[PDB]
Every structure is written in structure tokens, then in C-alpha cells.
Amino acid sequence: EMSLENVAFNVVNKGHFDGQQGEVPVSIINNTVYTKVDGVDVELFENKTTLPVNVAFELWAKRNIKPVPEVKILNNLGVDIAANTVIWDYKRDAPAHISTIGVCSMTDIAKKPTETICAPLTVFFDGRVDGQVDLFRNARNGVLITEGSVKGLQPSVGPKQASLNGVTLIGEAVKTQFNYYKKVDGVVQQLPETYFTQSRNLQEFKPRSQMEIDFLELAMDEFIERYKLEGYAFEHIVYGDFSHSQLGGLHLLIGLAKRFKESPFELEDFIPMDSTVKNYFITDAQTGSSKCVCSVIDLLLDDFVEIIKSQDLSVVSKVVKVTIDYTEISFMLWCKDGHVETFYPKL
Amino acid sequence: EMSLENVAFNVVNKGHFDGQQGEVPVSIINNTVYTKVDGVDVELFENKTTLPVNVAFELWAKRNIKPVPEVKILNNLGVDIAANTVIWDYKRDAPAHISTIGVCSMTDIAKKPTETICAPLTVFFDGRVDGQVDLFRNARNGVLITEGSVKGLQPSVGPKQASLNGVTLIGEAVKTQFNYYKKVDGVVQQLPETYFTQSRNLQEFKPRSQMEIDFLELAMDEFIERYKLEGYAFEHIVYGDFSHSQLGGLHLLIGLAKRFKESPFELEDFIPMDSTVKNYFITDAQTGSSKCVCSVIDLLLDDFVEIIKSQDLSVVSKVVKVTIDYTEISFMLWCKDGHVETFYPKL
Amino acid sequence: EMSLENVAFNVVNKGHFDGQQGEVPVSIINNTVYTKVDGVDVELFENKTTLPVNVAFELWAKRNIKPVPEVKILNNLGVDIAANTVIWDYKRDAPAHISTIGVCSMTDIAKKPTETICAPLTVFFDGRVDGQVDLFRNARNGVLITEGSVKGLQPSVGPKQASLNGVTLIGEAVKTQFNYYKKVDGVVQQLPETYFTQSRNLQEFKPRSQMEIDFLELAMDEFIERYKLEGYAFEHIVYGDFSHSQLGGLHLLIGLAKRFKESPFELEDFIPMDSTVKNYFITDAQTGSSKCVCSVIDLLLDDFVEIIKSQDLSVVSKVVKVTIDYTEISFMLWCKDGHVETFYPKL
Amino acid sequence: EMSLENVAFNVVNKGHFDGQQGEVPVSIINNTVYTKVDGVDVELFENKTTLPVNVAFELWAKRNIKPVPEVKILNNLGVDIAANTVIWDYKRDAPAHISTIGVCSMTDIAKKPTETICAPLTVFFDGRVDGQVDLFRNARNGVLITEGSVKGLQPSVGPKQASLNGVTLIGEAVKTQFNYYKKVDGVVQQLPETYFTQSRNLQEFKPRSQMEIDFLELAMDEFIERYKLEGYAFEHIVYGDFSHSQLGGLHLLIGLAKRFKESPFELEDFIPMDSTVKNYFITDAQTGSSKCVCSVIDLLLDDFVEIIKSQDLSVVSKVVKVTIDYTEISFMLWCKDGHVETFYPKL
Amino acid sequence: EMSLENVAFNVVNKGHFDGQQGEVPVSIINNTVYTKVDGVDVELFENKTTLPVNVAFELWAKRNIKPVPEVKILNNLGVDIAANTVIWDYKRDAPAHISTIGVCSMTDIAKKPTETICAPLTVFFDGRVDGQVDLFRNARNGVLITEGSVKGLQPSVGPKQASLNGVTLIGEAVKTQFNYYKKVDGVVQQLPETYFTQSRNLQEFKPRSQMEIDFLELAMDEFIERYKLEGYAFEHIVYGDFSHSQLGGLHLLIGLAKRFKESPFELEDFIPMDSTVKNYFITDAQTGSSKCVCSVIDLLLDDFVEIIKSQDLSVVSKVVKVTIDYTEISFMLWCKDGHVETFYPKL
């Protein structure tokens, strides 16, 4: 049975779609799904997508509830569609992909990824599901994740964190560290070496190295000397300059986290989606310094130090390419007299 | 005058419907009521109910602003409807009851509870309103609350807390501890002896006994020994097991509160209403341990200890009945070798 | 180009309307503007106004992103409309003014403030924009703000704080302290001497004098003696009386901030707009004391002390007028035996 | 009482707002007003305006239900707003004017047309309503209509037809022929000598002179011969050319009326409002000849013959001006070899 | 410029999108597009599609306004998408196809039909537009229509009628008879010999042969005698049986046309789209005979006689296949004693 009342039965009794049999009565009003409990209407789901309410409700109920790669990683690898599952995008509160394969009648383009309409699409496969390693072996364009080794294929070690029901975490009771494989036009690709962003947030920021512990505790001058960062404009790039009306620098998430613990500010996320580089309209409450487009990246500080120290501080300006999250991120390097003025990513 | 503009006049000038005379201009757009202040539109009310916007607005303005029983208590007693008042359900942001008596033309089924259409309904009466003790005396099916004694009737002492404008509190400047009476088919009933849930929330959790103070301070091993809880699986039931992908135990709200103060997690309330037992989709951020349907109850720990110590740990498994909030709650007891495996309620 | 797709191009690339050339594809559904990024829909804007979604979106994108006077100051000065800019009202999440001048085709009543339809309106001018001091000089009815001196005109020093992207702040990297000028029917007016409210909020409250530091630290009895406040009913007016079911006093925002740091309560803002005096439905969680209409003002405590000490405590009751935020605020003074019972503003 | 429930009481018991006292229960959902009749909801009003549903419902209930000038005439006379009434526009299913005077609190700009905000607006006054003639005498800008003489003021005889509850008619039981007066800046104007349109419609077209009777009855050749219409291209202008894929001519409503009874065609009114000139997207069903923009005007056939015979036929292209419905209409006149090629109006 | 305001400029000044430069102000509210004409909002477009209102408005403005094949023909030919145009479906009031090619940024899958995503799609090419014949020559899957010969390709003569702005017509001023060509995997196909339907409608039905003139004029008996139609159950199949509560027969549009002028009935089109076979819920008003599912096909009466006379009458039930509108139609043929009982199409 593929029906709205059976989807609602599974949500009410199992928390998500579990393939149980049964029905509950449902009312659809506004963009909202309601169900009746003891004679009163209880909201089950509010549609935030651009899809019909009943279609969005079913896709949400059928979301993957295992640790899955963050949406930004799948976007950078060019994933178009998932084989037999729904990746829910919790930043957008919507499905990550426009179409499905074997999930929902109103959005399926196929029931199996072997159908010819899927061959030109990059299909995401999940080695933890039975038979999907073999489906990837025969797929034309695919991305495969596994927890272990795949016989015949060289792995690429992915990020340590994954997403579990919208929570980004480095797993202890569960595995969040995947191997990645990619096929293009039938040929297995070699994925480039890459840094990974850390997927942390401002208020809950926790360091992941001694350098990041030192950065959050030490005064700015102490930190720069201890790690020998003279001439790299860390005061501008990382700490931020709040002395003028236009906010200077502040392009690393750990810099915002240090400023935020001492002085809260406003972060307007005007394009609310998951991406390697984020752009913010930031307003500093303490000083009134602000910037309309501030580009922020959450690299491990040890990685960002390693990146900026490998730059020729001798030319005036240039665009630098850095592989981060399997994609090439452009950094605008501004130098002056053998020293960095600033160094910031672009979205 | 029973009109939308007069309802809005009372909200703007008195904060709620107070029976004052006057009108303000109103605009209805989307599911929202607006009023004009200094030539600009100000939102008064956003309809979250399944009712028409103007009907929901009036019911909300006429909500009871005194301490009232929590909606879950009225549901457990089988209340269908209130005599001459609106119980607002702040969990659902909607009226607790589908119909009214003497409140609103679009939802009234009668103007007085003495009308014959009310006799088969369990009507909620409030002894703090004049004449309602006598209405209950003549009602066929009713629940009555009072602050003091009723001549002729044996009281049942209710919970210590009540709800005041959506805030659950044990009152000091006001009385929140009611006597309860029930009539069924014309006969006064004897309400059973019962435990009461405590209606606390995760982030604001405050203990209400020495055992709950000890539980929140002591290490797990200390607490279990001090109160002689060996063999009752408190480590599983109350503290929670976060070592596997499937979260074990964790069925008491105080257990979640202890875990939350040290490590925040995600609580998806997929049926958002007031009930004695709640079901949550929980994801632990620190470990990635999760459970789709976790049943949680907020009993005083001294009560839950008293309940579990009265169980025959000798049979393998059985359903136990416990009277809580005037209703019989089923607990699934799993035992092994004269010791509890787990003990959890069901919704 | 005045188009929805070009407005969305500016928002996506510049964070706000910046007059750049370009277009992005847009979908309008519900009351929401979406744009497509990597083939998925991303929400740019949710319309909370009573305007058409595409009109509200453009007005929001064209909001003033400089420090501007708080909306309550412009309302008190009788501003009807802004010359060539949009003042966004972040309390209402809507434009402050119904019409525009040279901003948007669907809301403009003129392209320039010199047009005859503007002459009877009080137009807000901004001296930081070129030519607007001269426009005010020729305007019939206007309010002008500058950072410096205007040749020929006597200034009125305004409040220290202004609003920057919805954040109220006293600026350090930017100027938030303006001079104010007003013209009525062609004649420059003398603005009255006035107190200013402080525009602080409950959870982030920070004192701005020694008396306010003392108030937040000292016990109530210490504070009253030290500053010689016997006979002015500060225990009632400022600290609040929570001993009865009806909450007594508590009309200064610093009083709520002191109570809130020790005991959280509920503040229902039933008319959500910016005004000098606010009215709240307050419920105290600790005691259950509550009041449907509690009028709160955020004066500097040194100012409120200075105001109440200048009152004749000899009459029973009267309405006192006080100039605050350029408007006359009525205070109901209740006295008994040469001492204040209470002293509260009215909205 | 000014309230939604009282407006719906008048609509239900009197067909429109008559100022009776009483209230009926009302539900508002979608953009529709409903009322309960014997326990079921009956729709009273569907909102087709861009106003809030309850505002539009009130303006519709208070529409003028006497014969009023057609909206096109008031527009051409520059009317901005009506004094103490609502002119409903039945083509648009919406109020003719954006604001009101003493009608509705949410749309009024004044309670009387003597208030200074109304002085720069051209206000419509109805001499059939008491005191309105004197309001006009004092007004600055206005249009006055009367049935008979006004002292001191020279009348202009308007059209014979008026609109009554949406129906255009020349009245027999009631008077539809009005005298017109216009003031601009306190000075009475001479209204120019004008032709008027006949406000007819295709499907139920009816001739109004012998020549029009001749036009629908006689063959095209007999007609052009009889009234000496050689060289004026009536075959093209009035009868229309359906031989090519682009429909030629057909710029007079009586012409379309003749073809319609002969052969069906579709008229897309892509700007549905009342104007002297209309534009249509016309698709002829028998031949497939069609034209995206066909400009149609409904003059008395004898009036239109009198017009094109007052033309100088020695110009390859010129723009003629005719006073029609008190406004100037641009006709494009193509000529070749001293004879007309075509002659059509401009919207 | 690709923008909503420029689309509405073309609609307002040209009746449809003509690629003119300019913009008009637009308001979007509900599912409707409005524009201001002299200070009041005029509706331009109501969205009846499942697309976002602004997307649907653009596709409608860019619809093909030349004679195009009827949607049913394209569906039967397997057309997936049109090359560089919008085929509007006037039955559904929506685009015929889900995606576009070089039309609209929110719906395009490509800018040209040469892009590899279009190769597996059956693309409709219009030989009246320049270069489209060659695009077809190179395409992998496609349908081509022309007015005249194409070199090397053998034509298939399609129907005589086409659709022009929603009106089905056999063109006289314009050509509606197309040659058809179909490629599948780069190989031109032989289109099968087919009958075509006449696309007529009841109320304004018009005979198209002597036999059809005979059918509407003569009595049923004279008709069946004249053309030798004994044993074929024309009284049942074509004329219909209204004697029982279940309506018998009546499977030909000309048959319904005859009854309609004789006696009114209601046809519920419970699947409102264009197909060779239609199903209706029919309720005969004079007798009360009715049928939930009545399958109606509109063949030329002489074509349908030629069909049922090519049948073997010695089978109790068989499924006949007729090529109609380039597709196969299943007719169920009941027979008994060597004569027809009924013969009706399948949807």
C-alpha cells in the first residue's frame, strides 16, 4: 500500500516510514498534514518545500535515518539522485534531490537505478545496503560510500563526520567515516587529495587540535608568536578587524566563535543551504562594524595554517585553488611587501 | 456585541477578551489577523488551528487565564467540553476541545450545560465560577474541580501543578492544587488512587526530592548503591545506554535531564500534544546513538523507585498496569534471572 | 532594470539590493520567494507583511543598511514616509511606512520628495545622503538627521543608540548619535527637551550607570537606603510585587531584568511593534503572579529616579506628563499620605 | 456598529448593506466569507480583489445600488475617490477606487470630503444625495452629477446609459441621464462637446438607429451604396477582412456583432477593465484569421460615419483627435490615392 | 531581459510575449498576477497549473499562437517536449509538456535540442520555423510537422484540423493540414495508415458528410434502412437506449449531438484532458437514464461505418484494433446470433 494514510500510520507509530501496515485519518489544510488523536487535530508535518504537501510529507517520512554524507559533500561530487532512499536536506528542510529512484510514485523517474534514464545521472549508492556495491559496479555514473574495503577498488577516505537525522557528528556508537568511490562514464575515477571542512556551528564550537585550543584561550599576540604566524595577517584574516564601519577579515569559523563567546553579533544567512563556503551578512553588536558579504569557511586551523604558509607572498594578488570537500575552492590572495594583506575564499 | 472587531478591541486594550465595548479595524490575510496602529498593520494572531482564522482568533481571545488543569489530566478523565470557557492547548496552539458551551456562535453546541445535547458529554466544571458546583450536581456526566471542600462529596486530591497561560507551575501566589470530582451517568464516581507526572522540561529541570537531588549530583554507581537499586537495571532504564547504534533504555525524564546538562541531544517530538507518556525520536550528538520511538515519562524518582520495587522480578516478561494521571499506563517489564532487563511505559 | 529577477540577483550576490546588473531564476509559491542553486530551490524571503510577496521582497532588499533612528523615534516625530530609502521595521518584519518616494513602482507616490503630493507629508531626510539637507531646507514638512552641524539650524541631540540591520547599538566603529531637525508647514520647529528610552532587552540587559550597576547587585533594601529612595514605592514600582495573584508594579525594564536573572517568567507581547511604552501580559513562573496589561518602559534608572523625585506626593492621584523620545508620555501617579503608592506609564 | 458580523447580517436579510442592526455568525477561510444556515456553511462572498477578504466584503456590501455613471466615464473625468459611497467595478469585481471617504475604517482617508486631505483629490459628488451639491460648491476638485438643473452652473449632458448593479441600461423606470459638472482648483470647468460610446456587448447586440438596422440587415454592398460610403474602406474597417492569416480591420463593435451571428469567434480580453477603447486577441473560428491586438470602439454607427467624413484624405498617415466620453482618443488614419485604407482607435 | 515585469509588458501591449523591451509594475497575490492601470489592480492571469504562479505566467505568455497539432496527436506520437516553443493545453489550462527547451529558465532542460539530455527525448520540431527541419534531420528522436514537402522523407498526411489559440479548426485563411515525420534512434519511421477524429463538440456540432446530414435529419429507421445498417445495432451503439436506468450505448459524439438538440443532458468530464477516447458521467434529464462511464469517440460517421462493417460477427467477444490518431484503439465487440449487440471504444 502506497498511500498517505499508511505513511501517516508509520509516522505516528514508528516515528518515520517503516513499511508497517495500517492507516490513520489525515486532514490536509494550508501546507500542513494533521491527524486526529482523541478527537483533536495534531500537526504531523508542515511543508517547507516547493513540492505538493502530500508529496513532501511522504519524502520526509522516507528519509534516510542512518548516518549519511553531508549534503555539501554530495553536491561537490556531483550527485544527482539517490538509489532507493531519500537524503533529507535539513538546512533547507527539503529533499536534497529533485527526483527519486524507487521511493515515491509522484517523484520517481525509475524503480531501479539500472534503468536507462538513470545511466547519465550520477547516482549515489550506499554500500551498507545489500546489493548496492554491485549496482555501483555496473552503474555508468555513480558515487559509492562504504564503511569497509571494496574488492578491486582504491578507496578515498572521506571526512570524519556525517549527518544523522540532521545532526552532524563524529560517530562513536556508529560509523560516520566512509570510503568514497566515483565512476564517470563507466570508468572508476581517482578522487583528489583534499582537505575537509569541519561542519561546526558558532555557539557550540569545540576545538579539535591543540592549536585550536590555544587559539581559543591565548591572547591574539601570544598565539601569533607561539606558532610563528608573523607576516600572514592573522589579526585581519582570522581574528577580524572591527575598528571601521566595514568589517575587515574574519573568514574562518573559529574566528567568529572566539568573537562570539565574548561579544554576540548577527549572522544573516541570506542563501540558507549547505555549502563548503558560506556567505553572511554580519553585523557586530558591540561596535557596529558590518559587512554585507562575508565569506566564512570552517577549516581546521592546523589545515588553514598549512595552506596559507605554502603561498608565494611575493606577487601582489592572485586566485589560489585549494581542494576542499572534493571541490576546488578559489581563495583571493592579496599581498603587499612580502606579507599578506588578506586571504579569503569565495562562494 | 459578538464581533471580530470587538474581540480585537479587547485584545489590543486588555490583552485578552474581557467583555469591553469598542471596536478596532481588522484585516484578515493568509491565516493571520492584523490591526492598524498609527497607519501600519500589526499582527495580532496567527492561526495554527484547523479552524477558520476568525473563529480560532475569538476562541484564543476567550481562553481561560486562570490556573487550569493540564490538558493531559482532562483527557485522561474523559472531558469532552468545558462549561462556559475555553481551555487553550498551548502544546498544540489550539483549543483543547472541538466544541464549546456558551462561548462562540460558530462553535457552540449549547448556551448552557443543562441543555439536553450536553447530557451525554462529560462536561468540565470549575468550582471557582459561581453556580458551577450546582451545575455539576445536576449534570449527568461531568468533571468538577474546586479549591476547597464540596458539601456532600468525597474529594480526590489532584496534582500540585496546574497550567497558567501555558506555564506549568506549582502556585504560591495562586492555588494550583485542585480537588477533583467525577460523575458518570448521574452517579458520583470514586476516582482511583494515582501517581502524577511532574510536567517538567529538559532544559529547566529542577529536582523535587532528595533522591532527585542525589541523582543529579552523584555518580551513577554511588547513587545506585546508596539507594540500594542493584538488580533493577537503573543503568539501562534511567541513565541510558549510549554504546550501541540503538539507544538503550532512558525512559525517565530525569535521566534525559542529567544527560542533557553534560551532552546535548536531539528530541524529535513527532506527535506534539500533551500526554502522560511521550514518544521521542532521539539522536545523541556525542555518540550517534539513536532510537526512533523512545517512550519517556516524568515521574518523581521516588515514585518510580517505589513502582519498580513492587514488581515480581521472577517472570520473563509481562505488561504491568500503573495508575498515573488518573489513567492506567501499561509498562512492559522484561526480566532475566531475577533481575530487570528493562521497564518502560507505552503510549 | 526594475525587475524581480534582478532584485534576486542582487540579494544572492550582494546580500541586499545594490544596483548590480544580472538576473537569477525565481519561483514564487505560498508567500515565499525561492531561487534555484545547483538545481534545488532555496528560500530567499518569506513575506510576513500585508503586501504582495513580490512587492515586500523588493522593499526588503532595498532596506537601509546604515544606522537609522529607531522606528519609535520616527513615529513620535510624526514621520510619514522616507525620501528615497526604505526603513525596515524589524519588530514587525515589514516596512515602517506604507508608501515610498523613488524606491518601488508598486508603492511609490512620487519619485522625488519635491513633488506636490509629498508637501503635506512629513518626509524623513538623511543628511548622510548628498543633497538631502537641501531637500529638507525646501521641504514643507520634514524631519532631518545629521551627524554634524547644519549651517543655520539649531540641532537637537538625539538618543545615543540607533538601529543597524535590526540591531540596536551605541556605535563605536560607526556613528549612531544624530542631530534632529523638524519643519512643520515650512517653519523650523524647536524640538522639546526630552528623555530617551534605552532600547535594551531582557536577557541581554547591561547597565549604563553606577546606579544601575548597584541596582543589579545590591539587595533591595540596601539600594533604597543608599540612594535615599524611601517613600517613593520602589519596592512596588521597580522591583515588583509577586505575593498576590495580581502582579503589583514592575514598570521599569531594569526591574524585569533583575527578576529574570533569578527567576524566568513569560512576557506575552500582544501588540508586537516598536513603541516608547510597551504593554505585556506577564506570568511569573515561580509564584504564578500575573497581570494582563503590564506597562513597561526602559528609562535609565538615574532618569526615572530624577522624574519621580520631582512629583508632588501630596495629591491623591493625577496624570503626569513627561517628554520621552520626543513625545509626551502620561504617567498615572497614585499617592497616599505623602508617599507614592505607584507610578506607571500608559500606552 | 461597524463589524463583519453586522455587515453579513445586512447582506443576508437585505441583499446589501442597509444599516440594519443585528449579527450573524461568519467563517472566513481561503478568500471566501461563509455563514451558517441551518447548520451548514453557505458562501456569501468570494474575494476577487487585492484587498483583505473582510475589507473587500465590506466594500462590496456597501456598493452604490442606484444608477451610477460607468467607470470609464469617471476615469476619463479624472475621478479619484467617491464621497460617502462605493462605486463597484463589475468588470474587475472590485472597488473602482483605491480609497473611500466615510465608508470603511480600513480604507477611509477621511470621514467627510471637507477634510484637507481630500482637497487635492478629484472627488465624485452625487447630486441625488442630500447636501452633496453644496459639498461640490465648496470643494476644490470634484465632479458632480445631477438629474436636473443646478443654479448658476451650466450643465453638460452626459450619456443616456448608466450602470445599475452592474447592468448598463438606458433607464425607463429610473433616470440614467445625468448632468455633469467639473471643478478644478475651485473653478468650474467647461466640459468639452463629446461623443459617447454605447456600452453594448456582442452576443446580445441591439441596433439603435436606422443606419444600424441597415447595417445588420442589408448586404455589405447595398449598405455602402445607400449611405454613400465609397472610398472609406468600410469593408475593411467595419466589416473586417478574414482572407489573410492576419485579420484586417474590424474596429467597431457593431461590426463584430454582425460577424458573430454569422460565424463564431473568440475574443480574449487580456486587460479586463472598462475603457472607451478596448483591445482584444481575436481568433476567427471559420477561417483561422486572427489578430493579437484588435482595438474596438463602440460608437453609434451614425456618429462614426459623421467622424470619418470630417477627415482630410490627403495624408499618408495622421493622428486624429476626437472627444469621446469626455476624453481625447487617438485614431490612426492611413490613406492612399485620396481614399481611406484603414482607420482605427488607440487604447 | 528575462523578467516577470518584461513578460507582463508584452502581455499588456501585445496580447502575448513578443520579445519587446519594457516593464510594467506587477503584483502577485493568491495564485494571480495583477498590474496597475490608472491606480487600480487589473488581473492579467490566474494560475490553474501546478507550477509556481510566475513560472506558469511566463509559459502562458510564450505559448505558440500559430496553428499547432492538437495535444492528443502529439501524445499519441510520443512527443515529450517541444523545441523552442510552448504548446499550451487549453483543456487543462496548463503547458502540454513538463519541461521546455530554450523558453524559460525555471523549466528549461537545455537551450537547444542538440544538447545530449534531449537525445533520448522525443522532441517536437516545427518545420514552419527556420532550421527546425535540419534539427530534425540530426535529431535522434523526434516528430516533425511541415506544410509541404521535405526532401528525401516520405510524408504522412495528418488530420485536416489543428488548434489555434485553443480553437480547433480546419483553416481557410491559414493552413492546418500538416505532413508528419517521426524518427526513433536516428531512423525515420513509417507512420501507420490511420483514421483521425474530428475534434467536434456537442452544443455546436456540425455535420461533415452527407451521411452525417442524413443522421441528424432523417428518423432513425429511415437512416438505418438507407445505408443498409441492419444487424449493427446503431439504435443501441449510436442512437443510445434510454429506457432502462442504465443508459445503453451512445458511444459516438454525433449520437450525443442528436439527443442533445432533442433533449438536454449533463456530461461530467471526470478526467478533463485531450484524448482520442473520452469517458463521461452522463445523466439524461428527460428519462433519468444515466451511466457512470460512457466512452465516446468522435469519428466521421462514414469512417465508423467503414470500421464496424470490416468485422467478423461470429465471436461472443473480441478486442478489435483500429489505428486512430496514429495510435491503436481497443474496441470491445459483443455479438450474438451473428449480429452486433454493442461496439464501444476503450479509453
Short mmCIF file of C-alpha atoms in Angstrom, two decimals, chain D residues 219-344:
data_model
loop_
_atom_site.label_atom_id
_atom_site.label_comp_id
_atom_site.label_asym_id
_atom_site.label_seq_id
_atom_site.Cartn_x
_atom_site.Cartn_y
_atom_site.Cartn_z
CA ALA D 219 -25.72 43.13 -47.64
CA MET D 220 -22.41 44.95 -47.34
CA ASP D 221 -22.68 46.29 -50.90
CA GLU D 222 -26.22 47.65 -50.59
CA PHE D 223 -25.22 49.29 -47.32
CA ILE D 224 -22.10 51.03 -48.64
CA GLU D 225 -24.07 52.20 -51.68
CA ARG D 226 -27.08 53.51 -49.76
CA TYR D 227 -25.29 55.83 -47.34
CA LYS D 228 -22.63 56.81 -49.91
CA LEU D 229 -19.63 55.19 -48.23
CA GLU D 230 -17.31 54.55 -51.17
CA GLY D 231 -13.63 55.24 -50.56
CA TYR D 232 -13.93 54.91 -46.77
CA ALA D 233 -13.00 51.20 -46.59
CA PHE D 234 -16.00 50.09 -44.54
CA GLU D 235 -15.42 46.59 -45.89
CA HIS D 236 -12.05 46.66 -44.12
CA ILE D 237 -12.61 48.95 -41.12
CA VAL D 238 -16.11 47.93 -40.10
CA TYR D 239 -16.85 44.59 -41.77
CA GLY D 240 -13.34 43.16 -41.43
CA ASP D 241 -11.08 41.20 -43.75
CA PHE D 242 -10.81 37.48 -42.92
CA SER D 243 -8.96 36.32 -46.04
CA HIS D 244 -5.40 36.52 -44.70
CA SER D 245 -3.89 34.92 -41.62
CA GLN D 246 -3.81 38.40 -40.05
CA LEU D 247 -7.35 39.70 -39.59
CA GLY D 248 -7.75 43.11 -41.21
CA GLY D 249 -9.84 45.92 -39.78
CA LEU D 250 -12.88 45.18 -37.60
CA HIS D 251 -12.56 48.16 -35.25
CA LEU D 252 -16.25 48.81 -34.44
CA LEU D 253 -18.34 46.75 -32.05
CA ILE D 254 -21.32 46.63 -34.41
CA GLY D 255 -19.01 45.06 -36.98
CA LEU D 256 -18.06 42.23 -34.63
CA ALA D 257 -21.75 41.86 -33.79
CA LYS D 258 -22.57 41.18 -37.44
CA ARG D 259 -19.85 38.57 -37.92
CA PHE D 260 -20.70 36.87 -34.63
CA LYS D 261 -24.28 35.99 -35.57
CA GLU D 262 -22.88 34.90 -38.94
CA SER D 263 -19.89 32.94 -37.62
CA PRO D 264 -18.43 32.39 -34.13
CA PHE D 265 -15.13 33.73 -32.90
CA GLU D 266 -13.21 34.13 -29.66
CA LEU D 267 -12.32 37.45 -28.03
CA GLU D 268 -9.57 37.31 -25.41
CA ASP D 269 -9.87 40.42 -23.24
CA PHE D 270 -6.30 40.45 -21.97
CA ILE D 271 -6.83 43.68 -19.97
CA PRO D 272 -10.25 43.18 -18.37
CA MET D 273 -11.40 46.65 -17.32
CA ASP D 274 -13.77 49.37 -18.51
CA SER D 275 -12.29 51.79 -21.04
CA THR D 276 -13.53 53.78 -24.01
CA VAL D 277 -11.24 51.75 -26.28
CA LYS D 278 -10.77 48.01 -25.77
CA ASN D 279 -8.06 45.70 -27.10
CA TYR D 280 -8.80 42.07 -27.87
CA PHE D 281 -6.98 38.97 -29.02
CA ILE D 282 -9.42 37.73 -31.65
CA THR D 283 -9.40 34.30 -33.32
CA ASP D 284 -11.91 33.73 -36.13
CA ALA D 285 -13.15 30.14 -35.96
CA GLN D 286 -14.33 29.70 -39.56
CA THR D 287 -11.24 30.99 -41.37
CA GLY D 288 -8.47 30.95 -38.79
CA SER D 289 -7.75 34.63 -39.37
CA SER D 290 -6.69 36.21 -36.10
CA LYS D 291 -5.09 39.31 -34.60
CA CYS D 292 -3.22 39.67 -31.31
CA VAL D 293 -4.23 43.30 -30.72
CA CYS D 294 -7.52 44.45 -32.24
CA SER D 295 -8.74 47.82 -30.97
CA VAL D 296 -12.55 48.01 -30.79
CA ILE D 297 -14.71 51.05 -30.03
CA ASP D 298 -18.50 51.03 -29.66
CA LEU D 299 -19.78 54.23 -31.20
CA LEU D 300 -23.20 54.81 -32.66
CA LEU D 301 -22.69 53.90 -36.32
CA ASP D 302 -24.12 57.26 -37.40
CA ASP D 303 -21.71 59.02 -35.04
CA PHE D 304 -18.76 57.15 -36.56
CA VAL D 305 -19.81 57.96 -40.13
CA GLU D 306 -20.03 61.62 -39.11
CA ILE D 307 -16.43 61.32 -37.84
CA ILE D 308 -14.54 59.70 -40.74
CA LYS D 309 -16.32 62.05 -43.18
CA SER D 310 -14.80 65.05 -41.38
CA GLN D 311 -11.31 63.91 -42.41
CA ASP D 312 -8.76 65.25 -44.88
CA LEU D 313 -7.85 62.31 -47.15
CA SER D 314 -4.60 63.81 -48.46
CA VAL D 315 -2.11 62.45 -45.91
CA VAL D 316 -0.28 59.12 -45.82
CA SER D 317 -0.68 58.89 -42.03
CA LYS D 318 -2.07 61.22 -39.36
CA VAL D 319 -3.36 61.09 -35.80
CA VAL D 320 -6.89 62.41 -35.39
CA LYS D 321 -8.30 63.58 -32.06
CA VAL D 322 -11.96 63.01 -31.19
CA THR D 323 -13.56 63.93 -27.87
CA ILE D 324 -15.22 60.66 -26.81
CA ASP D 325 -16.54 60.07 -23.28
CA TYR D 326 -15.07 63.45 -22.24
CA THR D 327 -11.56 62.37 -23.27
CA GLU D 328 -9.38 62.59 -26.37
CA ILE D 329 -9.00 59.45 -28.49
CA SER D 330 -6.17 58.99 -30.99
CA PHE D 331 -7.29 57.48 -34.29
CA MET D 332 -4.66 56.46 -36.83
CA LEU D 333 -5.79 57.29 -40.38
CA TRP D 334 -3.96 55.62 -43.25
CA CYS D 335 -4.74 56.91 -46.72
CA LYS D 336 -3.60 56.20 -50.27
CA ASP D 337 -4.65 57.80 -53.57
CA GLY D 338 -7.04 60.10 -51.73
CA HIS D 339 -9.03 57.24 -50.19
CA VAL D 340 -9.01 55.59 -46.78
CA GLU D 341 -7.07 52.38 -46.21
CA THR D 342 -7.87 51.93 -42.52
CA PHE D 343 -8.92 53.99 -39.52
CA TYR D 344 -8.73 52.52 -36.03
#
